[PDB]
Amino acid sequence: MKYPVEGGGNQDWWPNRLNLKVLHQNPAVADPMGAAFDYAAEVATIDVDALTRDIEEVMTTSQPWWPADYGHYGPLFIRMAWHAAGTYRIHDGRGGAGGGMQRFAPLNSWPDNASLDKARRLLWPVKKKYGKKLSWADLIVFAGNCALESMGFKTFGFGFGRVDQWEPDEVYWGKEATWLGDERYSGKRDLENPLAAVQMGLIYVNPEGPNGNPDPMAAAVDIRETFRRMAMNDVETAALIVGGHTFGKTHGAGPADLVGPEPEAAPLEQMGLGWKSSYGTGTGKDAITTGIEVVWTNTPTKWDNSFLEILYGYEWELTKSPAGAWQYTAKDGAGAGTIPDPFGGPGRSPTMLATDLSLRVDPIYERITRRWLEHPEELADEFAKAWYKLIHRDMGPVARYLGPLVPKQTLLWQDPVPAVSHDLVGEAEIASLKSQIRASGLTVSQLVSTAWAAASSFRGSDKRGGANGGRIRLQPQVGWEVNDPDGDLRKVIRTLEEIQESFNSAAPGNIKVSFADLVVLGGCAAIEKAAKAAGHNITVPFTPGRTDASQEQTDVESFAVLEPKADGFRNYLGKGNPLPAEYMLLDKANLLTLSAPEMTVLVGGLRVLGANYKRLPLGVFTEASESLTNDFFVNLLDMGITWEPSPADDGTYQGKDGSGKVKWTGSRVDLVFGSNSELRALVEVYGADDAQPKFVQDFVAAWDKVMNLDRFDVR
Amino acid sequence: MKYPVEGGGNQDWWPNRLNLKVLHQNPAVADPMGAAFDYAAEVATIDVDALTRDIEEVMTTSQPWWPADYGHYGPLFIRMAWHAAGTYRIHDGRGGAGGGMQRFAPLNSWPDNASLDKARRLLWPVKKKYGKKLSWADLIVFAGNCALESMGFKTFGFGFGRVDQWEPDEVYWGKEATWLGDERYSGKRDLENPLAAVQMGLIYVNPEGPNGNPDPMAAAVDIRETFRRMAMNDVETAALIVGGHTFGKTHGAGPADLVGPEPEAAPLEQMGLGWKSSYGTGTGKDAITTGIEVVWTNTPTKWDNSFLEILYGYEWELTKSPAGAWQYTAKDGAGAGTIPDPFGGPGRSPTMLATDLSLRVDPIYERITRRWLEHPEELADEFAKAWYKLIHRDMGPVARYLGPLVPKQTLLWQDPVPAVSHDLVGEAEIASLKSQIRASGLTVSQLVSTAWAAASSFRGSDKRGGANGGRIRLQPQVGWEVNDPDGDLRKVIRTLEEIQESFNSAAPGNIKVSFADLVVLGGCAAIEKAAKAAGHNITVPFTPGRTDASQEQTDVESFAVLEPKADGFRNYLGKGNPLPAEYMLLDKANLLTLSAPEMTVLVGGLRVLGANYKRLPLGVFTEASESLTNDFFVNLLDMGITWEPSPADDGTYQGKDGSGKVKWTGSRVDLVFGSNSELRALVEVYGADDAQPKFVQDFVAAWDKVMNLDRFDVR
Ligand code: HEM
Ligand code: HEM
DSSP: OOOGGGTOOHHHHSTTOOOGGGGSOSOGGGOSSOTTOOHHHHHTTOOHHHHHHHHHHHHTSOOTTSOOGGGOOHHHHHHHHHHHHTTOOTTTOOOSGGGOGGGSTTGGGOGGGTTHHHHHHTTHHHHHHHGGGOOHHHHHHHHHHHHHHHTTOOOSOOOBOOOOOSSOOOOOOOSOSSTTOOOOEETTTEEOTTOOSSSTTOSSSOTTSGGGOOOHHHHHHHHHHHHHTTTOOHHHHHHHHHHHHTSOOOOBSSOGGGBOOOGGGSOGGGTTOOOOBOSTTSSGGGOBSSSOOOOOOSOTTSOSSHHHHHHTTSOEEEEEOTTSOEEEEESTTTTTTOBOOTTSOOOBOOEEOHHHHHHHHSHHHHHHHHHHHHOTHHHHHHHHHHHHHHHHTTSOSGGGOBSTTOOSOOOGGGOOOOOOOSBOOOHHHHHHHHHHHHTSSOOHHHHHHHHHHHHTTOOTTTOOOSSTBOGGGSTTGGGOTTTOIIIIIHHHHHHHHHHHHHHHHHOOTTBOOOHHHHHHHHHHHHHHHHHHHTTOOOOOOOOOOOOBOOGGGSOTTGGGGGSOSEETTTTEEOSOOSSOHHHHHHHHHHHTTOOHHHHHHHHHHHHHHTOSGGGOOBTOOOSOSSOOOSHHHHHHTOTTOEEEEOSSOSSEEEEEOSSSOEEEEEEHHHHHHHHSHHHHHHHHHHTSTTOHHHHHHHHHHHHHHHHTTTOGGGO | OOOGGGTOOGGGTSTTOOOGGGGSOSOGGGOSSOTTOOHHHHHTTOOHHHHHHHHHHHHTSOBTTBOOGGGOOHHHHHHHHHHHHTTOOTTTOOOSSTTOGGGSTTGGGOGGGTTHHHHHHTTHHHHHHHGGGSOHHHHHHHHHHHHHHHTTOOOSOOOBOOOOOSSOOOOOOOSOSSTTOOOOEETTTEEOTTOOSSSTTOSSSOTTSGGGOOOHHHHHHHHHHHHHTTTOOHHHHHHHHHHHHTSOBOOBSSOGGGBOOOGGGSOGGGTTOOOOBOSTTSSGGGOBSSSOOOBOOSOTTSOSSHHHHHHHHSOEEEEEOTTSOEEEEEGGGTTTTOBOOTTSOOOBOOEEOHHHHHHHHSHHHHHHHHHHHHOHHHHHHHHHHHHHHHHHTTSOSGGGOBSTTOOSOOOGGGOOOOOOOSBOOOHHHHHHHHHHHHTTTOOHHHHHHHHHHHHTTOBTTTTBOSSTBOGGGSTTTTTOSTTOIIIIIHHHHHHHHHHHHHHHTTSOSSBOOOHHHHHHHHHHHHHHHHHHHTTOOOOOOOOOOOOBOOGGGOOTTTGGGGOOSEEGGGTEEOSOOSSOHHHHHHHHHHHTTOOHHHHHHHHHHHHHHTOSGGGOOTTOOOSSTTSOOSHHHHHHTOTTOEEEEOSSOSSOEEEEOTTSOEEEEEOHHHHHHHHSHHHHHHHHHHTSTTOHHHHHHHHHHHHHHHHHTTOTTOO
């Protein structure tokens, strides 16, 4: 239908096709910074106090195009930072403040991010001054932290180092083609995975209650669950909501139909700004943001215990803002004129949202907030800890936290590992340990499967998971179905520990090795052994420095989201995946941050290496096992094989030769590489006659890339 | 509505949004070969005789799964090769066999490319043997050439060098959301630019004549027009149809309703193959491809004059193929039994497509073909020329042609340039000529605008245009309205020619300089002088070797598609553009092979330098013109400036200050950078405090790229 410059593509002719562009997000060519750029280096040199001072100058310097409530943009900036982090979800670890995504589509034009577009525009003079040394990602969330401290709250600390990106993160936010649409519930109130919001374009919940019904008791069930799915428990949730509504006010001064198009749909001349309003001045006094007109506290620019003193201090009755939105006001005209107007007007009466009353009406939130009514210091403590978690949740290993405000305290949710407490294995020790692992009885399959089990639990979205920690032998990973607990895993683990014990006893100097490194090295040792069986002498690069975590450093509930329901690299398909196998493979490869070439060598390599879940013959197109050849590619391209969906319809295929006899069996994941015109192209590369040396080179680079995915401790 | 891995994204929310992904086509990460892969160097090592011998072995080895007509895949490959080359179009330069795009969507699944899927599959054995030394793109068309030569036609030559791409070139193929749909004609017949076919998914025209109506006279008008829009005049067109239809047959044995889904829509087990038919055996003698059943000649695996002897030897009556396709057969039962069956069956009568008859019904075609009836040697000669052109039209400069089979003869369609006659200007002479161009009194705008005019004539689609040839002083480029001929251009030519003489006829020595690189050098000296005005000492790098073409080496009607109806880099926008200015900018930058970073720095760079068409102040956001600064970027992010469309709605905007006076004017092209969320990110990089050296550094790398786009003579 359309020009490519305007969006036309192959997806238009075949709507449901495999979209391989998820394997080339943020390509170097789109990046203006050049290959040598390293943000971490830059921001480590930034003057934090100059930055803070300049932010605090922006916060108190009102701008005519969006005048500042109470002469302070602070509350506006805490909501910005809360919304930027607030998109995070646990199921896949996507969203979050990590990549500065609120500045792009569709997040920059979510209905719930209305007036954040001006909010980030106000911070331009800060970015202007600090340039390369300060990512918008870092600035957006830091501005909120500064807002907090500016207005009287001592934050627990802050980590710099979020890398700014240049095109939007393609995230599934839901199936609704309508803003604020809700097609995400089944059963009683079961919310569709991976989502962590109640409707499309909202951060968590409806400010007017479930589906717009201002029932605080019901709303609490939505707050409990969305926040759960953003890694927040009851105490953190409560802490955050009260902590947050302690500052600022909502905006709904006129009718919402008087508000223009969201930033993405808006006129060129609006310069990236959206929701331009025709009500009065359309800003400041006359500002419509949500359509709700609430000022929770008498001190909207100061941290105190006023929020709870009000919530519990008055009785609440349902009412309508000047835009027709549900909210609560204090009964019997009580508190008449106690709350101040943003722009000097007369005082107002106490107001709360339906969701604020959830904190008072829900049994659990009741016990928590009535406690902080009487003991306000516990609230600061819990908000401090929660806010730090909020804006850092998706920054992964603490190695990534940069700057003078990063505190020393280790947090369980950071999935911490011990510091390196001995000398690391040098070249001679690695070569020693490789030989030992090869002499241990463990097979190529066992070592490669265990190594892959451990490293491929990493996801690039929130940077959780991976081989570091040696968590493969801890719960839950030790009992994951894909890691095949009742399988060989425990034989492999016990063997690697004995070698760990052996080496660490006989070891020279003060060199000691971790189990975590040995798992990975066993993989590297096995890939060398296989390469030689195939007539190649290569060594597989290993990078030491993994440490072993204890069960107590490993939150079992938090690691549950990291369990694969599918792994196409092991020909594993569990139940409950949203899409057919091959779409789950691209997603798994996207999570491991792999290119299409890198995904392709790994599948083919791993199949002939025997990495398949339960050692199934699906996609093992080779006569020689324990041998790193390109056989998978050669055979998938063989036209002597006729492929047919299996008689016992089980998601598998039969490859029959000329005689009629089955030679090969395949999964959908296996066949997709002969079927997808773009994957076949990659298969014709590594399936050529000159191709086997290149296949081994590229497999090893890929495998190494995966083993090192969580290694921010050495980058 | 959908997951990103199923194609879901921001276009779903905002359908007509500027799609910047056109600027990162073929990302390096999706390429499995590696940054250091050099195809030129690979193909240099091939045994072309051994390749040919292997191709010949493929053509004569029938495969069970698609058996060979007359035991020879030659003609199928000729059609494959013809279809590969035959998507090209002059308006765009896009399409062609140059990228081996026929193996990817949407071209692999076009209705007209039916059974070509099988034809390419047949070549795997060759590609498998040769590996990286042979691209699919080269192999597809070379198989065609080999075919011709194996069946007794000596071809003019062949050049290797077509690099395989890894993702489909997304090209605008038409409005139609239906296959074979037609929504591309207005008026009597005027075809929609930039299209060069009469329906969606057709190479040129309907075999059954316009809209299935088998009027040979009318079909000829369509052949003329589509073939013209693919660079073929009447002789070439007639030579090609005749030459091709000397070989093979059409396939329409049974009903099209019994033929399956095309490759992109077909089940995994078919392994990238499509249109599987349930009619009979579904292959060979039962093969259905178009629905037409025509064998043109009596020696379908041999070159002779029998196509024309048959076309003129009989009288043709309208009939229907076994599939209800219009086609012609010899009246009066004549020529019964004379045409052989592809698989041993009995003889059959002569048959011709409606479009074949166009060749004796059309006055011009008729003159041309009736000549070749008695003068076959002139058909041989013209076909060889046309086929060569067909297979090479998108190769660009002759320097790109590789292998032992490239002929010596210069051809006018290759837009040739003289070889380098005498010695090249060295470092002393470069800086000497530099200083001398600055001391010319030609202004920074003049020098820069002229240098851009020349180099930005290039398009990386067919690799035509650019500053080699010094064609800016020749017709039609010196007349191009965007090159603003009624302005400075003549004076700039005069003055650079004057300096050319002065340098060449000054000091005896072996060194000579051309006007071609003097235009580029002058632009380069201007940009050195501009950067000095804003306090940077830089050497803009420059490579010599450009040579001057003559008017006689410049085909004025051929260069007419190379004319910009829009150049956003000069803020020019003519009439007749299909899309608004900002889209035409992204298309332009795509044809210049630019990245979004590169586009961005060049616009703002060229804005302040004075490169604007008619020197308009639109986007010239600077106080100090002819000085190289990041001003454009600083100023587009100034919030003190309010943008509104101009009262005289001329596509222009006004940027007023606090006082309400207009400080700036801009077009769509200018403000898109301050409006689009991804483009604003880039201008926020170049407009920050620390950016000026980086802007300049990047502007010059981007500039040296545009100047060098031509220069396959030196890489
Ligand atoms: C139960 C979940 C939550 C709901 C339903 C909710 C809802 C809202 C609404 C409707 C507004 C008014 C927006 C406007 O019209 O300007 C608002 C403002 C605000 N929110 Fe919340 N919010 C939630 C959680 C939080 C959290 C966790 C924080 C941060 C810790 C937070 C911080 C703020 C701040 C500082 C403002 C004031 C903005 C300004 O003054 O301009 N909220 N919230
Ligand atoms: C207006 C121009 C043309 C029209 C309308 C046209 C139409 C057709 C059609 C309908 C077929 C049969 C496809 C099938 O059912 O298998 C065909 C086949 C063929 N074409 Fe053309 N064609 C044109 C030009 C050409 C050209 C320019 C060449 C190359 C010089 C060419 C070479 C061939 C060959 C070799 C076959 C036989 C394929 C085989 O034996 O499998 N054709 N053409």
